[PDB]
């Protein structure tokens, strides 16, 4: 899939987008791929941070569905108006697509200022689409007009600019080291895994695995930290702290208050720990475990800002744990695969790693339920 790779640019911490077209003759974009959502929205209309928008009246095959649509968030808002046109994506597959898109007409904390983006590109399944379920996310479109196979796979490789891979319709071989493991998706809205233990440096929290897993535990493209459900943060940080302690850092800093600084080319990288997450496997009673370092966690602003934080929606596997991988989300098969990305950051001493089997039983005890 020579085409598509690295088809994905981005600045650090802005997201990660991808080329695509609207309408006919074809309107270029630059749309983030956000597997935490499943709307795709474009800016419609002059805002100052953007630097072009969809622009409806030159579009022949555009079509109105005369409906609006509000999502609110926890700080801003995006509101407009549902369409459909024709889409295509310049480095994916051959093929163009009839879309709802949301052309979006009034928005706040959306658009970023100074960034190179303008709409967003939600890979995530129909429940979670808004207004509602009715509205056919773009994959799913993709796949019932084309014969493109029902997945994709993406390797983050982490202003800086930074850039990546989407893979649609397949996986590309050289873009991971080892074998691909998969983990089931437990249910098809947000792409929800189950984690089933976590260690620091090799030693279990000990918590009931229900914890790490409330209320869900997604992998989320859109999201820039691993975000942890408060009760598993407080004890992920208590280890990280005590795990580090040769060097004392400020209390602000494990809350994100603050950076940590060194001089150029002497971060004490040995000195932090690995994070492990053991995932569901897709056999019963079989594990196994990704594994991450202070190269993914600690994120660069030589000062860093520590990008693992606590949460009220469940566990965010975002960027922190996808540059270290390369993830397929073979919706086909509902499962989400992990191998050893071949861009991902690293030092002499420690890789990120993916590794199998381990005996993990009561594993389907560690999922959440009303
Ligand atoms: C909708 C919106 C308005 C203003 C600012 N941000 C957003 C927004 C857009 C896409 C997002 N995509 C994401 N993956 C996330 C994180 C994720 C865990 C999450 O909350 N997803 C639900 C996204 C939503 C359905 C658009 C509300 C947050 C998002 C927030």
Not at 80 to 103: C, K
Not at 111 to 127: D, M
Not at 300 to 320: E, L, R, W
Request: one cysteine or more; proline letters at 5%.
């Amino acid at each position: 899939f020579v085409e598509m790779v690295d088809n994905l640019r981005g600045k650090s911490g802005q997201g990660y987008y991808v080329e695509m077209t609207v309408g006919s003759p074809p309107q270029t974009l630059n749309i983030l791929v956000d597997t935490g959502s499943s709307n795709f929205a474009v800016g419609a209309a002059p805002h100052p941070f953007l630097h072009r928008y969809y622009q409806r009246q030159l579009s022949s095959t555009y079509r109105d569905l005369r409906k609006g649509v509000y999502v609110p968030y926890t700080q801003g808002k995006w509101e407009g108006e549902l369409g459909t046109d024709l889409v295509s994506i310049p480095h994916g597959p051959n093929v163009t697509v009839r879309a709802n898109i949301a052309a979006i007409t009034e928005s706040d904390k959306f658009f970023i200022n100074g960034s190179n983006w303008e709409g967003i590109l939600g890979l995530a399944y129909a429940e979670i689409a808004r207004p509602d379920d009715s509205l056919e996310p773009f994959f799913d479109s993709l796949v019932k007009q084309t014969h493109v196979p029902n997945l994709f796979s993406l390797q983050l490789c982490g202003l800086a600019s930074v850039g990546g891979s989407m893979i649609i319709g397949g996986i590309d071989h050289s873009l991971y080291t080892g074998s691909l493991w998969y983990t089931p998706i437990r249910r098809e809205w947000y792409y929800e895994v189950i984690i089933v233990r976590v260690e620091i440096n090799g030693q279990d929290l000990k918590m009931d695995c229900k914890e790490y897993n409330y209320d869900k535990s997604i992998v989320d493209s859109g999201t820039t930290n691993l975000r942890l459900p408060k009760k598993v943060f407080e004890a992920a940080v208590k280890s990280i702290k005590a795990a580090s302690s040769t060097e004392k850092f400020p209390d602000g800093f494990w809350l994100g208050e603050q950076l940590v600084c060194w001089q150029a080319g002497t971060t004490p990288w040995n000195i932090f720990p690995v994070i492990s997450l053991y995932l569901m496997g897709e056999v019963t009673n079989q594990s196994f475990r990704i594994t991450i370092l202070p190269q993914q966690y600690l994120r660069p602003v030589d000062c860093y800002k520590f990008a693992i934080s606590q949460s009220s929606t469940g566990t965010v596997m975002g960027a922190v744990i996808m540059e270290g991988f390369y993830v397929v989300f073979d919706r086909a098969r509902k499962r989400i695969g992990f191998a050893v990305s071949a861009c991902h950051v690293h030092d002499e001493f420690r890789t990120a790693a993916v590794e199998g089997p381990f005996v993990t039983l009561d594993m389907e005890d560690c999922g959440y339920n009303i």
